[PDB]
Design a protein around this ligand. Structure first.
Ligand SMILES: CNC(=O)[C@H](Cc1ccccc1)NC(=O)Nc1nnc(S)s1
Ligand SMILES: [Ca+2]
Ligand SMILES: [Ca+2]
Ligand SMILES: [Ca+2]
Ligand SMILES: [Zn+2]
Ligand SMILES: [Zn+2]
Length: 168
């Protein structure tokens, strides 16, 4: 496991998240079923909570960008960059921003939204890049055919136990 320069983490136990928009390649109920799998990600860590919003400000606004919008990093279209997935801090640091990225799927055939939402929300919550392959926080998206074998490795559990403090 590795963390961003200076060690940026969220100083508050109960969370507050906002969904920005839904992608055209998937229906509403699957995108919300796994946003709920990473939100729990946090809640299974230590006691990290989460409250669902549709309006206002709460710096975990899960997001998107079809090519460009107006900030700092332009997009490529197919392949490489999943999002400017942004890490803990004020405003621009917190929240996501996808490209008109990939052909989103529930299974591995097109592009698995579970794997990508748990890794980019992971970039929004504090962890950077783990050089392991099976630990999820690896720099490139591979091809897990059998999605039932997708478990969080011991490396990430030991590190964030030593980051926010173990579960009660
Ligand atoms: C905000 N703090 C950070 O330190 C960086 C900024 C950045 C953003 C986008 C590309 C390079 C660099 N965030 C970050 O690595 N997010 C990632 N998103 N998708 C990845 S693959 S890795
Ligand atoms: Ca891309
Ligand atoms: Ca942000
Ligand atoms: Ca797309
Ligand atoms: Zn942005
Ligand atoms: Zn990454």
């Amino acid at each position: 496991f590795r963390t961003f320069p200076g060690i940026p983490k969220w100083r508050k136990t109960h969370l507050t998240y906002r969904i920005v928009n839904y992608t055209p390649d998937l229906p509403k109920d699957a995108v919300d079923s796994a946003v709920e799998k990473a939100l729990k990600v946090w809640e299974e860590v230590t006691p990290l909570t989460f409250s669902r919003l549709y309006e206002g400000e709460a710096d975990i606004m899960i997001s998107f960008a079809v090519r460009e919008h107006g900030d700092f990093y332009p997009f490529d279209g197919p392949g490489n960059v999943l999002a400017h997935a942004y890490a803990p801090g004020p405003g621009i640091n917190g929240d996501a921003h996808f490209d008109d990225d990939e052909q989103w799927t529930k299974d591995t055939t097109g592009t698995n939204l579970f794997l990508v939402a748990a890794h980019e929300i992971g970039h929004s919550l504090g962890l950077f890049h783990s050089a392991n392959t099976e630990a999820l926080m690896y720099p490139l998206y591979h091809s897990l055919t059998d999605l039932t074998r997708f478990r969080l490795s011991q490396d990430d559990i030991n590190g964030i136990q030593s980051l926010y403090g173990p579960p009660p």
